[PDB]
Write a protein that binds this ligand. Structure first.
Ligand code: BCL
Ligand code: BCL
Ligand code: BCL
Ligand code: BCL
Ligand code: BCL
Ligand code: BCL
Ligand code: BCL
Ligand code: BCL
Ligand code: BCL
Lengths: 350, 350, 350
């Protein structure tokens, strides 16, 4: 009855490049867990080297129970140092007949708890890295409508010590709250450094917060890897969409970006370690209907390269094309769709 | 092997009424998760308009590992305003050879975080509403036995800043603790405003606490809807019971109450949005044995009305009777029994 | 396809003894959830009466993604009172080319929240007991290498109020964090009472913390039972090991120790109530692949004794040997492997 069907493919560049074409599609006839359905959404992310600044753009469109929403954001981003990154951007959103814009500037500092060479040198592929990452943000929003004015007013009301504590249940709406802990993540109370109305009027807020993780949170544990600006030698982009309702879900992703593979040391490369948050959080919705898997993965290496290690083992190979399907691989698929994080490692070399 | 069999039926009143007869029965041959079994329980709730005060009564009987417990409570309840409700009641409990009574008075204030007409007007059927709800309670208990005297004494011992913090692991015993977070809920430390012995002696405590939610907690997000006193034009009641052991669980619910359907706007009505907490919390015990579903739902509309929208679609219809079974519906059943919250919406009209 | 096969056996001593031989083996062809695989581990625990002091030894060996680790610890332990236990020990660990030793002394105080005879006398087999357990620790570690010196230095840096708060995401690495709450457990911020370098140099730290639980945490709720020093009339030990990878997991446990059975009152004895933490925490990894069960349990009573109550019922019996397999028992197996805590009670008598 219930079969999840999906197909993935990755085509890698070789040489120095970490770039890969990634394609994914899935279809499964189970209800989505969204308490308002149908829900559809499309997203697209582009990143282009400006000059080491990256202009990163996002556009998101969705319809939730027939209501249309959008979000657009364009941000320039750059690292000041290995621990500190800055961004400046602007964007807007719309929900049905309402919309508003914003602009902001910010800084983020990532900090690992307690780096040690004893670890560095003994663990070939480290995974959990605990740390805390501090956000400092300045944002402005034109109060060009009564809702905005109204909302700014109520915030000012609320803005004592409870404010920055209690805001958390407001910010991580619905099931988002509960996911924080599931990820071994933590969100600090927020601190408002200032809040004012500037010349129409603009509401301007300066505030901060930090989030931490015990190692599963990839945003902290893989801070540098997740922003591979040094390989961004041409535009990258990724697009995805899903349609979902009480009968099924289907989804398509396609993109071209760097970071798909990574040096693994000793002449070898790997497909990058699977990010853990996506597994753990999708693990919260993946266990609601039993299903069988009808899945395939195709990996096409760059010319001349061969897979040196794969567990689960690929099923077939020809020249640079490798395919996985059935067996342990299908068991792994099921496992990860339900929230499992077992390693599926693929190393290759020339 | 493992089949959950269940049957549900709802018979609605028409016109202005939101009332419905609700019947439900389930049987499944899997062990309950209770670490003491067998466990049986029966509960009954009545609500009668006094005058806009409601007298609400609860009687609960259970046997846990052969020990008998009971609980009875009668409370008069009323809203002062849309945000503030008050109650006054009394009751008692028994556990094996021990029992004690109590009486109390209290007030509860519900507060939504940050209502906006921009939302109000754009979202036709809103679901997650974040908020915090403040309880203020005065309770008295006759210290008519040595256990009571003893317990009051130890509380007074404990009553520094830790007290109201640490009490939480005491209050949400066993797996109840962990469920708070699963629900995106939060419970504040308690504050004891006063504690005294009044003329035999009576221990009297005045204390408070608040609980919050990110929108899944229906108690906050659906504060007003959950107390449909305005439709309580005659007594309402509901009764349920379950028997459970290491081999199976069976349960029966039957009731007649208002609030089963609701105006949905535009001439339409709906069966009320499914409350989310019950799904999410039963989701914590629903994934321990695989099972197949053998389920049916029968909805009988009021004369003359027809279903205008149902997803998943009903399976058969005749005159005012509609039935769901198999297919997407059975998949939805499974989904919700495991902790899923996908919408199953049913709208009808004349 | 996916079958978990396992076999358990328990051979009990009779008379006054609570001792039992426990054997367990499992094999299942699903990927482990460890994000680095393969991972293998072996552990052995011995406990010997010194004089009421127990010398307890642990040796753990593992290989994680080809890196070898070890841990050895020998501790003498004793109860001062029913609430307070003390330990003194020493040990060391190694990770690949690095190692370090340590020694410590400590005290642990367990405290139940609010004991009542009204409960004591009415509940024959109590399960959830809320409490908090305070640790006070003194530890020393020779700073005999640069990593150690380096690490001690960074800790001193970090050692304000955040320190003992934030340390938690460091300490409960990866998915360990999230498990605390799943268990209804809580870990307090740590307090450093002192930190110094003593004459090579030795880093010495005195610090404390407490952990609490709502009743599922067995360490608190079963404080005394879990250290059955009074029955330790000869050495006890237990050994276990597992091998795991992306294709399967296999595990073996074998041991001889007291505490396997317990007086149940009224001439009866029981196999001890199943500890709940192991179920709840393994529940976090047990739901990632569907499987069928191929399991058996054999219990061999002491001569002359008979099972007076078993639910689920045993399948076959002969003389003192009882066997469970299939049916409700297999359903129970599945249930507990997925995180279920339903009671499987076995009482016997002569
Ligand atoms: C029965 C098991 C089914 C299954 C059952 C479910 C169910 C049930 C559902 C999904 C859902 C999803 N599934 Mg699944 N799914 C299966 C297998 C798959 C497979 C596959 C085989 O390859 C795929 C590709 C998917 C893909 C998906 C997505 C389409 C969707 C999660 C959307 C998303 O990422 O939300 C990401 C959302 C967020 C990140 C949250 C945003 C909000 C919070 C408030 C924001 C805070 C984050 C932070 C603030 C952001 C700010 C950062 C900026 C830097 C400022 N499923 C299996 C086989 N799947 C869910 C869904 O949406 O369906 C539509 C769902 O309900
Ligand atoms: C403001 C956001 C941060 C950032 C935050 C993160 C986080 C956080 C992560 C990544 C991860 C990755 N990012 Mg980064 N990333 C940024 C900008 C960049 C830029 C760039 C030069 O601008 C590039 C090239 C990348 C590229 C990379 C890849 C190295 C890696 C994804 C690998 C993969 O296979 O994807 C293939 C993609 C898929 C199989 C599915 C993609 C589907 C959709 C299209 C992405 C939506 C994700 C999410 C579920 C929904 C977002 C909801 C938001 C609330 C709106 N990032 C900026 C600086 N990046 C991930 C990783 O694994 O890092 C180690 C990860 O966890
Ligand atoms: C439920 C299904 C699992 C999943 C199961 C699989 C499987 C199975 C495999 C991989 C594999 C890979 N995965 Mg994965 N993967 C998930 C999510 C991600 C995310 C992410 C940011 O969410 C990242 C960056 C990756 C990273 C990648 C690479 C490490 C690797 C090669 C890419 C690939 O095959 O993509 C395939 C593309 C997908 C799996 C699509 C995932 C789409 C996710 C669900 C998000 C969709 C967002 C939605 C469109 C937008 C919502 C936005 C709104 C705000 C709500 N996965 C989801 C959670 N992934 C392959 C691998 O290991 O090769 C060695 C592989 O075999
Ligand atoms: C394998 C999957 C099985 C399944 C496996 C399980 C398992 C396993 C169990 C159940 C259990 C339950 N299942 Mg189920 N169940 C299935 C499908 C069903 C179906 C169906 C098909 O229609 C139904 C109707 C049920 C019904 C039930 C109930 C009989 C029971 C939850 C009792 C309850 O609500 O506790 C509500 C309890 C509370 C609210 C907690 C009270 C204590 C805390 C401390 C109180 C705090 C709340 C707050 C303080 C209250 C104060 C408020 C006042 C205003 C002052 N199951 C599926 C098909 N089900 C559980 C059970 O009890 O079985 C007996 C359980 O163990
Ligand atoms: C002190 C308690 C509060 C209160 C708290 C809540 C909460 C909280 C909720 C409701 C919900 C509802 N309540 Mg109200 N409710 C109160 C008094 C009222 C009165 C009244 C006039 O006195 C009435 C008529 C109602 C009626 C309603 C319905 C609108 C709705 C249930 C719909 C349904 O289909 O049920 C059909 C019933 C079933 C299918 C199963 C019922 C089974 C058993 C019999 C109920 C036990 C529930 C729970 C699991 C066990 C309780 C454990 C306690 C610890 C002891 N409430 C008082 C003021 N009410 C629910 C909802 O959906 O609101 C939007 C909900 O979440
Ligand atoms: C595990 C099974 C799921 C469940 C699955 C279903 C299914 C499936 C459907 C509904 C449907 C409905 N559910 Mg539901 N529903 C659950 C719990 C609830 C609760 C509640 C207070 O717990 C409420 C008020 C409702 C509300 C209702 C309505 C929205 C709707 C019409 C009523 C109906 O069919 O009832 C049916 C009656 C039940 C499902 C019985 C549920 C009994 C719950 C488990 C509590 C029993 C308490 C026990 C006897 C007392 C314990 C007290 C002690 C303190 C421990 N459900 C439980 C958690 N529900 C129907 C719908 O959507 O129509 C459009 C439908 O098809
Ligand atoms: C699909 C369902 C499968 C299944 C899927 C999984 C998956 C998936 C996994 C396991 C894993 C495990 N399974 Mg299982 N498993 C199944 C059924 C079984 C059966 C059986 C049928 O009898 C058995 C015996 C096992 C046995 C096991 C173990 C080999 C392993 C958990 C190791 C451990 O305890 O970590 C205990 C670990 C800790 C306690 C944490 C240590 C770290 C934290 C930081 C320490 C803090 C604690 C505290 C600080 C300690 C200090 C105290 C001192 C007093 C100072 N599984 C079912 C049938 N199983 C997991 C594993 O490891 O596999 C290798 C895993 O990934
Ligand atoms: C410093 C640790 C504490 C302690 C902490 C605990 C905790 C905590 C628990 C026990 C439990 C038990 N302990 Mg004690 N225990 C200590 C010392 C003792 C001594 C002794 C005289 O020295 C003895 C005889 C026992 C014996 C007992 C039994 C009564 C019972 C296990 C019953 C069983 O069937 O096991 C059969 C064993 C198995 C079926 C599987 C055993 C597999 C492996 C070999 C044990 C590893 C467990 C864990 C998953 C991995 C440890 C990871 C650490 C981070 C390194 N403990 C010391 C004082 N003990 C458990 C219980 O049920 O208590 C009520 C429990 O929860
Ligand atoms: C996933 C499987 C479940 C499990 C399912 C079963 C089943 C099924 C049954 C019992 C039964 C028993 N279990 Mg149990 N049990 C689990 C874990 C434990 C733990 C523990 C400290 O972890 C304890 C002390 C016990 C206690 C015992 C007894 C109460 C009872 C008689 C012993 C027996 O049959 O052992 C059997 C031995 C096992 C089940 C092996 C469990 C090994 C656990 C997973 C830990 C392995 C640690 C690993 C080797 C080291 C990791 C260390 C590193 C730090 C990571 N179980 C694990 C979590 N248990 C039997 C019973 O109820 O009889 C009445 C029975 O039928």
């Amino acid at each position: 009855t219930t079969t999840a069907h999906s197909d993935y493919e990755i085509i890698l560049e070789g040489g120095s490049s970490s770039w890969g074409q990634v394609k994914g599609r899935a279809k499964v006839n189970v209800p989505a867990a969204i308490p308002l359905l149908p829900t559809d959404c499309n997203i697209r992310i582009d990143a282009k080297p400006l000059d080491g600044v990256v202009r990163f753009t996002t556009k998101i469109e969705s319809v939730v129970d027939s209501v249309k929403n959008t979000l657009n954001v364009e941000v320039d981003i750059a690292n000041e140092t290995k621990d500190r990154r800055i961004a400046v951007g602007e964007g807007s959103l719309s929900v049905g007949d309402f919309s508003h814009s914003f602009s902001f500037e910010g800084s983020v500092v990532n900090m690992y708890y307690y780096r040690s060479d004893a670890v560095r040198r003994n663990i070939p592929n480290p995974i959990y890295m605990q740390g805390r990452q501090f956000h400092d943000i300045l944002m402005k929003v034109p109060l060009d409508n009564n809702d905005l004015v109204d909302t700014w007013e109520g915030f000012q009301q609320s803005i004592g010590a409870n404010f920055g504590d209690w805001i958390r249940e407001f910010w991580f709406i619905g099931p988002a709250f509960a996911a924080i802990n599931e990820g071994g993540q933590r969100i600090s109370p927020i601190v408002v450094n200032s809040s004012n109305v500037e010349g129409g009027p603009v509401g301007v807020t300066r505030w901060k917060f930090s989030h931490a993780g015990s190692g599963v949170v990839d945003s902290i544990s893989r801070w540098t890897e997740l922003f591979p600006v040094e390989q961004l030698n041409k535009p990258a982009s990724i697009e995805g969409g899903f349609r979902s309702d009480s009968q099924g879900i289907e989804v398509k992703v396609d993109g071209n970006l760097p970071g798909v593979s990574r040096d693994a040391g000793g002449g070898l490369r790997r497909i990058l370690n699977h990010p853990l948050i996506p597994l753990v959080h999708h693990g919260m919705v993946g266990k609601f209907n039993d299903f069988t898997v009808d899945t395939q993965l195709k990996i096409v290496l760059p010319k001349g390269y061969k897979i040196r290690y794969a567990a689960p083992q690929f099923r077939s190979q020809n020249l640079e094309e490798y395919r996985w399907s059935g067996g342990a691989y299908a068991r792994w698929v099921e496992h990860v769709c339900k929230g499992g994080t077992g390693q599926f490692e693929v190393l290759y070399a020339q």
